[PDB]
Amino acid sequence: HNEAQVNPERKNLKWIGLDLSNGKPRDNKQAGVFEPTIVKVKSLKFATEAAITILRIDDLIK
């Protein structure tokens, strides 16, 4: 994914997934492992919210 940014021509190298069978990097859009965008986006939102809420609850002494 570094080459997806430094190299402006290797744009279609971004979906290199994790091939759990052979344990090697693998183009994953061709492979077909897929996730709904809403799932990832909203999970990121909730992870951030949970981290923020726990991190706010700090100013205690015990």
Binding site: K14, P36, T37, I38, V39, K40, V41, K42, S43, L44, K45, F46, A47, T48, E49, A50, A51, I52, T53, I54, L55, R56, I57, D58
Partner: protein
């Protein structure tokens, strides 16, 4: 633990929202908490950390929506 209570509550409501992702959201939240604790150990106030996390999420959803 009350913090565990909050984390499990967020995981459960996320499950009720979309379904898959509870384990991923819990793992990511724990990793963020560990890293933020390491940061605040270095004399960075948690409010700056929280603002940075919010900015990072706001930028990450935009990056995903374009790629």
């Amino acid at each position: 633990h009350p913090a565990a209570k909050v984390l499990c509550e967020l995981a459960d409501l996320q499950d009720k929202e979309v379904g898959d992702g509870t384990t991923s959201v819990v793992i990511i939240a724990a990793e963020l908490l560990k890293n933020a604790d390491e940061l605040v150990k270095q004399k960075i106030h948690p409010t700056s950390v929280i603002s940075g996390y919010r900015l990072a999420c706001k930028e990450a959803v935009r990056y995903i929506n374009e790629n």
